[PDB]
């Protein structure tokens, strides 16, 4: 490690080799504007915002990608720098459609914050913006080309982080635009509905498919009763919308606010989640005792199973036949609650507040229906629920707390930890150990693989006669790596591999509220969300295990008999088919 | 008091007579959109944004000015209400220029918040705007009629609370615009530079005169050294810009930030304020001992003295020849500091940070010059200081603290109370009692006059042979009332009256940062600012009395000789002439 000495603006510093002047000034309490810069993701120098005077330099240099050097002098407040920033913002703003009353981003468009910050009132230079081509055809992602700034963040994210890379650049000059391949639509190619591309864009050129009109139409029907259900991870970040500090639980406030909307029933996805935990435990027991297809993987997140269908069909024996916890609880409410309440199943409308955006495509699937009836009707993301609350506009900061409904709102901590990565797998191994060997484990040690961060390996003795190999995976690149190893066959001994496309778990999902870059250089939002969720876990004083909850025991005794029954297979078990690829 | 029962949205409530529905919903934790409503100021129903359904009503009614009645039923989320709100936003935005990148208000324009809140899709209803012209001619206030939406808050403020009313409405249809009288400019009529009209406008149609370009030109000069001057009320509300809670002191942080800006010298006005208090007290003693013109009034705030010379020339003999504390400090730096430092008086540039906007007109006055030299050069408000430091872009939330330079940065609590209501006169009577009778008083009981709030009276025995009558006034209507009473001669026995043009004192001045009506309904920002300033006063552990400060004693002994000297009169005392009126 080499030590570099540099002198800026009255202060000298020693830094390691590879240091950039930007985060060096950040550490030394100086801020420089950023558009195209992301920490360790997009470092190319296309933004052309961050100019600083360099001693001995013919012209200005961009501080974003500028490596430090020894003995240099840097001054950041010359008149040339200010004039260059003003003129360059005037140039770049002549393309972005200036009707900022109606952008979804609106208040936190980083371009708008820069525009106000530089105080550049006038725009002397006119122009002819590029062609307006609204791609309002796909299922989840909507693109608008009248806004895009060629920041290149979206393409870098979809190339590196997700290892999919269905976006590229075409043309030259004004003809240069970001497009999918073959001039098709997003849904016509192998897009995974990752949600990272829509969350990382600093302008609002991308938006999600809005179904709030359908929601208002559904709630407007007196003949239709509404069943709303909640994720464990909605209270992980929603408080950030209302100016609350990171890590606030508003669960009772959320229930009260949803009741003020006039929803007939409020409920949690937790109960069916415990049901499917019992499920995967049951076919674990079966595949152990019958030599089932191994290694086993879950079927929780729609995104990566979509990826497996699209790209690697050869692992289709390895998937779990179970349907998603969303799908489990949706079918459960549409059947058992309907039987108890003696109401026509078409007379219920079920709405879900989930953070994945891939569920928008997942609900559109033909085969996720029971008895020809829709298990769930409308799925919505956290951001658009927030805007629904804002258009209703109840002062959220003074709500009291409320409880959930019988029976399917009850909670357990091992099912609270669904929000973080591997909590599903933790609950599964804890429950199967409790069932088979009466073993009381709370946490599992994880082996961090050298050179790859985000992949986690574990192996704990479930029974003295059977030690189960455990692998955790989040991040599309990690999925690609572990799938390549699985095709190579070196994971033959492995038993469970848990996968989601979105890195860091659902707290880092596509439906989570938008955050800027500044807080990302400060604090990992994943870390604070995980701490808040784990603190919520430690406070669950009713049950830390799913199989001990009296509600799931009641349902199993009365209506579900045992898992892997013919009724259980017919209602909760499904098959998947490979999808045609257009790549 | 009559009790009214009303049943809204599933809950019944009792209110006193005259309690309209909006605050009834507010205390019941329900919010309704407001544009044209202000608490106790503007109740007219022009906005037509706050529509709510009423049982048995042919059409919708505006909740803003709708009185409650017994046995009514109110529904707030019918589809009719939503469609009406959406169409009225679509209509009203068709006139407001949609160039929201470069409004001064920008981020916190209430129209932007409403536009995002209602989630308006597009504006199909095109056309042309009203005729436009920018009156970029007045000294302080700048108008842009292309933006304004006929909220009528500005005209109500300038009519009621200021008792000036130089704004009105003209024309029919599109020709209906708010304008001054006789198609003139703002500076051509009896405008007082109140600043309330600037602070209260919820759209950004009004702004202050910007001189940041002159500031950057001045600081760019190496041949000119810069001395910056701070008012005590600057840190009363600066923190609100950076997301800090109400009542945060960043004084040392401000000193550090200013030093990072390249200012050569920093100084606090408390020294000159103490000198002015001594001069006023010496004039007190002289007019008592020589039968001077009574009652005594200050000459502190430029606004009200502008009002007096413009409207009531008969009060000139009752006025005090002393200049404003910032002006006296500027002259002192122009003469005594120049003598000590042996630097040519034109080679200094002095910039002042005032919460008044009337100082912009005040510095333009030709009579306020010493020896043909400009006492102070540039004055800027707190808001544009925030803008200049934001574009300077140092991360203000992690700055350490710094001290002020000698001998003119030292402070006393008697000068800390300068910004608060009545503190100047408090310090004056405390110091004169200390000088003449060695009387130790910390606070004086005040008589609140019945029927008028903001007019404040006291009479405590300064000496057993002389009790001084004490009156404090803030608010243009209160100024008008006390001036009318003075002309009637009812205040013959009175000795001191304070006149602050902006209501509530300079802590509520035009230079303070913009706040929204949501802030104004629940809490008075004046109250929290006064509490912060008084807590700062209680922590002043160096001196609670001006005349015990060694710095003022040194300057009086070495350079100022005795107060009310011929040199003191020639340097610190001035005459005012009546200005022609065009009303
Ligand atoms: S980039 Fe989009 S959100 Fe930002 S100011 Fe422009 S239109 Fe508004
Ligand atoms: S969406 Fe547009 S602005 Fe955002 S990264 Fe992609 S190309 Fe750049
Ligand atoms: S959804 Fe995923 S695959 Fe599709 S463009 Fe975005 S990041 Fe790429
Ligand atoms: S992290 Fe969450 S949103 Fe992302 S794929 Fe997994 S379950 Fe879906
Ligand atoms: S009213 Fe002014 S500040 Fe508000 S959006 Fe329009 S232009 Fe921008
Ligand atoms: S400044 Fe103009 S737009 Fe604002 S309230 Fe007054 S008249 Fe209406
Ligand atoms: S500065 Fe004062 S007098 Fe002039 S328009 Fe504003 S409120 Fe009225
Ligand atoms: S109250 Fe304050 S801001 Fe208003 S005129 Fe007086 S000193 Fe200036
Ligand atoms: S912000 Fe520095 S090059 Fe992008
Ligand atoms: S807020 Fe203006 S009419 Fe009600």
Task: Provide an overview of this structure.
This is part of a larger assembly, with two copies of chain A (583 residues). With 583 residues, chain A is of the alpha/beta class. Chain A has a domain at 134-212: Alpha-Beta Plaits (2-Layer Sandwich). Chain A has 19 helices and 20 strands. Chain A has helices spanning 21-27, 79-93, 110-118, 153-161, 196-200, 212-219, 251-260, 270-290, 302-311, 325-341, 358-363, 382-392, 413-416, 423-437, 476-488, 518-522, 525-538, 550-560, 566-572, and strands at residues 3-8, 11-16, 51-54, 61-62, 73-75, 141-143, 168-170, 177-179, 206-208, 225-230, 265-268, 296-297, 348-353, 369-370, 373-374, 378-380, 447-448, 455-463, 466-474, 496-500. In chain A, the strands form six sheets. A five-stranded mixed beta sheet of chain A has the order 2-1-5-3-4, with helices on one face. In chain A, a hairpin with a 2-residue loop joins strand 1 and strand 2 (11-16). Chain A is globular, with a radius of gyration of 26 Å. Chain A starts with a strand and ends in an 11-residue tail after the last helix. Chains A and B meet through helix 2, helix 3 and helix 12 of A and helix 3 and helix 12 of B. Bound molecules: iron/sulfur cluster (SF4) (8 copies) and FE2/S2 (inorganic) cluster (FES) (2 copies). Residues 96-97, 99-100, 103, 105-106, 109, 111-112, 147, 203-204 of chain B line the site of one iron/sulfur cluster. Residues 96, 100, 103, 105-106, 109, 111-112, 147, 203-204 of chain A line the site of one iron/sulfur cluster (SF4).
